[PDB]
């Protein structure tokens, strides 16, 4: 999963 | 989109590196707002509550 960063 | 994503729980878009993005839609959630406890960003795919409701 990834982040908004 | 992505700079516009906000947390489903607290509704803020700050603390980007903690702000988990749904793999099924444009929603997000801070790991620290999530319940039960999520200590770290997961390695696998993550689906929000809206996306889960679409599953069969
Ligand atoms: Zn939040
Ligand atoms: Zn979703």
Author numbering:
A (entry chain F): 1 to 5
B (entry chain A): 1673 to 1728
Show sentences the authors wrote:
Chromatin remodeling complex NoRC (nucleolar remodeling complex) interacts with the rDNA promoter regions of silent genes repressing rDNA transcription. It consists of TIP5 (TTF-I interacting protein 5), also known as BAZ2A (bromodomain [BRD] adjacent to zinc finger domain protein 2A), which is the largest subunit, and the adenosine triphosphatase (ATPase) SNF2h (sucrose nonfermenting protein 2 homologue). Both proteins contain a MBD (methyl-CpG-binding domain), also known as TAM (TTF-IIP5, ARBP, MeCP1) domain, AT-hook DNA-binding domains, DDT (DNA binding homeobox and different transcription factors), and a PHD (plant homeodomain) zinc finger adjacent to a BRD at their C terminus. Our crystal structures combined with biophysical and mutagenesis data demonstrate that PHD zinc fingers recognize N-terminal unmodified H3K4 tail, whereas the TIP5 and BAZ2B BRDs recognize H4K16ac and H3K14ac, respectively, with specificity pattern KacXXR.
The structure of the complex revealed that the N terminus of H3 is recognized by main chain hydrogen-bond interactions with backbone carbonyl groups of P1714, E1715, and G1716 located in loop 2 and by hydrophobic interaction of the side chain of H3A1, which was well accommodated in a hydrophobic pocket formed by L1692 and P1714. Peptide binding was associated with structural changes in loop 2, which was shifted about 2 Å in the peptide bound state. As observed in other PHD finger complexes, the H3 peptide binds to the surface in an antiparallel β sheet conformation with the TIP5 β1 stabilized by backbone hydrogen bonds with residues L1693, L1691, and D1688. An important feature of the structure is the recognition of the H3K4 side chain, in which the N terminus and loop1 of the TIP5 PHD finger harbor the lysine side chain, forming a shallow but well-defined groove. The H3K4 epsilon amino group interacts through hydrogen bonds with two main chain carbonyl oxygens (V1677, G1685) and a long-range salt bridge (4.2 Å) with D1688 located in the TIP5 310 helix. Structural details of this interaction confirm the absence of an aromatic cage and the presence of negatively charged residues that form hydrogen bonds with the K4 side chain.
